[PDB]
Amino acid sequence: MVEIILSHLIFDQAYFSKVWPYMDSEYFESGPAKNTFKLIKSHVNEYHSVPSINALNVALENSSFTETEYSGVKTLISKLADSPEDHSWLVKETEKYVQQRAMFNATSKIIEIQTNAELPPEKRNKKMPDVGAIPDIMRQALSISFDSYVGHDWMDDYEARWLSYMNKARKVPFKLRILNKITKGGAETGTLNVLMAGVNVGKSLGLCSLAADYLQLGHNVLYISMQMAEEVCAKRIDANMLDVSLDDIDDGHISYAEYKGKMEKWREKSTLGRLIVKQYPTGGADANTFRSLLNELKLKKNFVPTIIIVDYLGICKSCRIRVYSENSYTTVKAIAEELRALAVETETVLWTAAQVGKQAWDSSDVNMSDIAESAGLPATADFMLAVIETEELAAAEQQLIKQIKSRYGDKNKWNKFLMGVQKGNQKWVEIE
Amino acid sequence: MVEIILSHLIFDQAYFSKVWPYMDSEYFESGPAKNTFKLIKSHVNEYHSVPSINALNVALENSSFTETEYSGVKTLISKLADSPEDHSWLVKETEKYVQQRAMFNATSKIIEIQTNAELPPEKRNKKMPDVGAIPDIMRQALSISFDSYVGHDWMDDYEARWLSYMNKARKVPFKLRILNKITKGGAETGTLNVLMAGVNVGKSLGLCSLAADYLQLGHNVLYISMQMAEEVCAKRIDANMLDVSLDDIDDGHISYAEYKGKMEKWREKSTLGRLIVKQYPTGGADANTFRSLLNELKLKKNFVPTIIIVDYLGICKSCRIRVYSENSYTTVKAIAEELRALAVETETVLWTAAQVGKQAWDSSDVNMSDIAESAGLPATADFMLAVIETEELAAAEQQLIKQIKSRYGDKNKWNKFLMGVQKGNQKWVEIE
Amino acid sequence: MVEIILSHLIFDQAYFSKVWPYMDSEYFESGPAKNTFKLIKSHVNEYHSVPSINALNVALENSSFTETEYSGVKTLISKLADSPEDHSWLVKETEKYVQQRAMFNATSKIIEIQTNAELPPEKRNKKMPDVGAIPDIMRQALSISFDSYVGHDWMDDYEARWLSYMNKARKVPFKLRILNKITKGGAETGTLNVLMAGVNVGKSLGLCSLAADYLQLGHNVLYISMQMAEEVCAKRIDANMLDVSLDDIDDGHISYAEYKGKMEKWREKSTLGRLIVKQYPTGGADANTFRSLLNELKLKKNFVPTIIIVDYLGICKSCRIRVYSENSYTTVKAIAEELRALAVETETVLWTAAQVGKQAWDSSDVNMSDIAESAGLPATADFMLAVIETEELAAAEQQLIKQIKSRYGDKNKWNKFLMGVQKGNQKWVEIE
Amino acid sequence: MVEIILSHLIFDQAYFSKVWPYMDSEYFESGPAKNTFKLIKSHVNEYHSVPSINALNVALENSSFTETEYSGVKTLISKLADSPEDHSWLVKETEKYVQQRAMFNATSKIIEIQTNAELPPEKRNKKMPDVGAIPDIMRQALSISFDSYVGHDWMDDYEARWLSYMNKARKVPFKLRILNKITKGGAETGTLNVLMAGVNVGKSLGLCSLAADYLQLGHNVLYISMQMAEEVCAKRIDANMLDVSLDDIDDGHISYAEYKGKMEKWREKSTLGRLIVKQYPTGGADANTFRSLLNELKLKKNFVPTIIIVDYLGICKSCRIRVYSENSYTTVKAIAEELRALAVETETVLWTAAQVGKQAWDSSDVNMSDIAESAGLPATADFMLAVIETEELAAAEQQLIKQIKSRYGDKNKWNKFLMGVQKGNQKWVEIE
DNA sequence: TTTTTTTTTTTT
Ligand SMILES: Nc1ncnc2c1ncn2[C@@H]1O[C@H](COP(=O)(O)OP(=O)(O)OP(O)(O)=S)[C@@H](O)[C@H]1O
Ligand SMILES: Nc1ncnc2c1ncn2[C@@H]1O[C@H](COP(=O)(O)OP(=O)(O)OP(O)(O)=S)[C@@H](O)[C@H]1O
Ligand SMILES: Nc1ncnc2c1ncn2[C@@H]1O[C@H](COP(=O)(O)OP(=O)(O)OP(O)(O)=S)[C@@H](O)[C@H]1O
Ligand SMILES: [Mg+2]
Ligand SMILES: [Mg+2]
Ligand SMILES: [Mg+2]
Incomplete structure (x- = not known):
């Protein structure tokens, strides 16, 4: 029914107002229909009005396509004529036609991706998306229903807004009291929280301590280590949970009986989730990789995380920018934005680590301007915390956590407090 | 499109009043088109009015043509109808047609000049110009645009200019006396206004404060969130309007009774406007998306916004340049130009935020050179204010606002003024 | 007469010494002639001497030519002979032939340009000059001659040097005596003058001050703006000439009676010109449009320009390069060349105002390595000034001019001088 | 080519004496070419002289030749002419022919060696070299060059080098006795020599003086100015040569009669050179534009300079640095390297100027450490003279010349000397 | 050819 759609795009102002915002060039044909719609779209972009038959003929004469295409477009334009119709049958039929064409294009692209990925490398016609984003494309084929959400009205829609304040399902409480106090109830789902410490100051000890604390509070935690292996992170978690020093494990001061007893005692407690550690090579995982990991975790292991942790965003690969194409600023900003998009998609608290510049190392204070790879x-990032350690602090087994970007509350209040990091047990303890 | 030009010359006075000044027999053709235009020109010269079809046919009978030309002119005259096409498209198309025909005639003229130059001096014609007249014959053919307006005169139009001085309909007050004082009556419609600061300083706080102030004045405000979600921002607007807190909303200190009472009391006010909050994914919107959103808003609800707030220009996506086609100085400036064009098209005050490079994130002052994105x-921009906060300022809850680019008024009359920013209420308070 | 040219290039020495530096491969037809000239040129480049017949037959055998090309070149070489003629008819005939070939090539190039322009976007060739570049090409072809001036030859060009000593070019005086001192009487007719400055520091203030000063001297001034409405520029001029602050005009302190009285008092003065302000959209005007504008200004308004002032060079259209085709440097250089050509053609002092880079902003000193868009x-340009009102000159109500490039005199004599900028009246007063 | 080689072996002497030692029978052919060379070699052996074409025919008349060979030889002998080709092209072309034939023979020999190697060991030729001899054989093919000149060979070019020391082949005198004394006979070709302008001490005056002494000695001088026009520099040259004061020309004291008389008096003298003044914009002339200028002057003006004087090194631009700066060290170091490379590749004496540190300005003594361009x-620079001015030197019309770097001779021999500077005539006179 | 981030280095 392409002829009817074009005719009522021309000879109906009411029809054009609703269907146009959604009409696209890939929904008609590879011949006369697409060319006619391209003519109409160019005229609309140039004059912000629906062209007439004379305007279409003039644009057709000032066009460069061949004789066959010219004749097809001329016949199609000559066949366009307004008919007595009703707005509803046309809008519904157009929605059905657009949805069908979107599904057809999506399945054609899916077949193309499958037949392209099944090719020897260096001859796979790059810039074509991989199989990983096969379902997502189909998800885009179903989100076309002529029902774009205009937005949220402050006065018209306030009961629904008020039924979001006492819900509190967005906030995930910490286990430390100070972190809950500064964040006013803990971190929120669909966010990106960051630890900035430097090199060998913390910043993975803190991530492991957070993972252990969330695990004790009945949470499913997904640790993703882009550098350290799976047994080192698991060893850190074991040291945190079992209250056994990393030196004791290395020096064999803990027996198998004690280890088994502690593990079984933790297992028999109802208030304990599941922690899963996954390792990727440095620069070999991105947002799409994490989504594939999420899907295979949900299917194979029936594991649905809420506290997804990534060891370092700077070590990950952007899923949009080719490697080493853009500078550090653009690449790191894109990686952080994609991670935040993943977090809001799966509704999980995302925790990450970030390096500071060389000038901030061995300094008694770390500012927000000391971020290493990007100012973006x-x-x-929803929340950032700076981990600072000096010789005096190290001798006191303490670290100073400074609130650098506090989006859940006022950062001026409680800006710097001293955590009791214990490096042997990979644990954060409060001083209150 | 000679038929359209002749038909709208005969049957349209508005078209005749803008194109007849620039029209010649050489522009049309050498056959029936030129003869028809010559008949029209002869009739308008003998009688200062646009001829009719009957008068044109009578003149054609009076005038003498050979059989072929007579038949061609009769056939062409038979093909004239009103056909009320758009005026803007018609004038643009006739300008293009005139330009291309003039270029063709100029090229033929210079080719004839070159051919005559090679002839021996005895054989060559003295009427044709020398080769030295080739260039100006070309530039003049490139100065046949349709524009009869010459501009102001400063001595013949001072009365109209004085009347324009009294047209203050472009101004929009600020609800803040200091901002009105420094803008000489508030911001103006169709202008790009920017509120720049560092990271986590209160850019979105200022945007929401401006939105609330414009809402309390009866304006229609369209808040477009790029990083935050739609609901979170409405909470800040509620904290500004209801004037309780941000934490008290999340800490349950407000019962439903008070919330309902305050919302209904604000509804009872006749000085309140309409506020719509729209969220977009990072890097997925521009004026092209904004124009479709405007059309959908106007269609679905009686909402034509007077104020358009964009959460951040940087997070926005340029229309023509791809996501990472060019560097920051280009696409950021392109987005700024597109936003200003959208504002001047919709005649709305456009507000947006801008980021500051790391060099001024901890400085007591910020200059125009401290713009993180393009310097375009x-x-x-038209009124680029700047927000500077220090430890002494945060102690007194008083952000410093520095006038960075002031197109409305004198940038240095009140260069730096203190505000009374309340972070809990997301409100700017004037200081007296 | 290609055969004669080749024959006397090979067999004659004075002819070779006279005509060789001006010969080019594009002056010969694509048949045997161009290939033979290629062989001759390669031999001359490799051995710095005129080849013989044996040399070329050796070069022909050691060449990658097809059978047809080889046969044609061999036949042409066989046909060459030393016909005795006079070395005063040969040189002029060769010059005529070269000029004709250059004109033919230019005509073909402009025909190709016009064919390329009419093609739709995304199919048309890029980096090919637009239609507005056609006359310039035709200006280059007519300049071909066997006489070339590379540098100034002492003892060979000394009459012209004595003329330059004794004669001085006519100067359009300023009203500020300091500019006359630094320019030895003012600015010449066919010049492009630029007043670079930072953003929001007085680019338009200085241009409007110059426009008012020239208007008070009896000149016809055309003010073309792109970032400002006609009423705004005319209000700046009124503030300059009526001695009323822009604050007074906006606030309504002055009445219509006083305004009319002052305007009529200015009208009654015989030493007054005509100032016409024309506004164009950003990127919507070029040199041809300025020419079309000057055309209607000379016709509709019957006004001949004298001090054309382009508010901003960086906004105007290229007129030689398609929009968004080359980089900023090339486009701005092309705009500058087009504007200077327009000034030379119209014999009008042309004043403009470019923007300095972000580094020069708030910098107490600027140099040529501070121009943002283009260092060309x-x-x-023929005279270039700068504005250095950075930090403390604004508090003292003063400015500073660097004199970056002064072709009228010596830049290192009064390089930096202080200007009393008054922003309420939008004028420059002298510190003397 | 073989016909030309044989013809110019028979009918030339320098070509024979140059190419005979590198001529072998296997280089020509297996029919006419080889047999004909065999005749030349045979005769050259029995009678140590070049055979007459008839004597070569006598060789054919008295030699073992098959009917085809004897005929072939007769035709080839009858096809040899005494035509006069240029010697350089002939030698180069016969060298290329010999090299190609030697390479072909060596490749065929190694192919035959490989083919013989892949044969039954019982059945193979013993005379064929083993496979291990292949790399050496090709070497003998690559070691074929009519003339071996790779660098300067000590103990093999000592006689030519002595002729350089006695004839002072590299020195260019100065016309000033003191400058010749400290340079052991003047500056050298392929060198960069700079004068360290101090506190407003000078600006082109010295380089203009150097552009007159060389002119009076018969040298072709190319003066490239950046901060001045051609007329101004040539006026400084006129002041020095015509003994007219610089201000007298501007005032008009000297009339056209005296000027023309002095110019013609200079033109009569045969000891006068040519001065070509070329102007370039500030920062718009790298040391690659100078190469193009030299090429244009050589091709069109036939002007091949021996002295190149650049007005100021700092004003120049680096050929491939992209970013230019008003006063940056990296650019000055690159500019100096590029200019010295130009001097070396053009075998010209290159002169330029550069600024020095304020310390060098305040102190009468200037140290290499006290230089604006340090280590660059x-x-x-082969020679660096420090020209500084003092009020006492000024009151006596003198300038103290100090030698800061002298590759030519010992720097401390005559380091300080007083120069008689005349600022009106722009001249340097010696002091007794 | 400019523009902007980050880093590292070096020169004054
Ligand atoms: N096996 C271990 N036994 C005891 N202490 C350890 C051990 N591993 C690490 N630490 C301590 O933990 C501190 C911080 O460890 P990490 O969390 O690995 O630092 P880091 O910042 O993650 O390293 P990078 O540079 O970011 S990969 C170190 O400085 C050590 O003092
Ligand atoms: N929900 C909140 N509760 C309390 N304080 C907040 C909240 N959100 C933001 N703030 C404070 O507001 C200030 C700036 O935060 P925002 O206004 O959200 O920043 P922004 O303008 O979005 O800029 P960035 O660069 O994106 S953080 C800081 O003092 C924050 O601590
Ligand atoms: N209405 C006004 N009243 C008083 N002063 C004003 C007014 N408008 C502008 N100014 C002052 O004039 C100065 C120069 O403004 P402009 O003439 O626009 O300079 P500009 O370089 O053209 O600015 P651009 O075009 O935005 S880069 C500003 O910095 C203000 O201080
Ligand atoms: Mg780590
Ligand atoms: Mg923000
Ligand atoms: Mg301006």
């Missing part, structure tokens, strides 16, 4: 990371 | 943004 | 502007 | 100019 603080802009695209 | 402080070229398309 | 000083080469095209 | 006293590293790429």
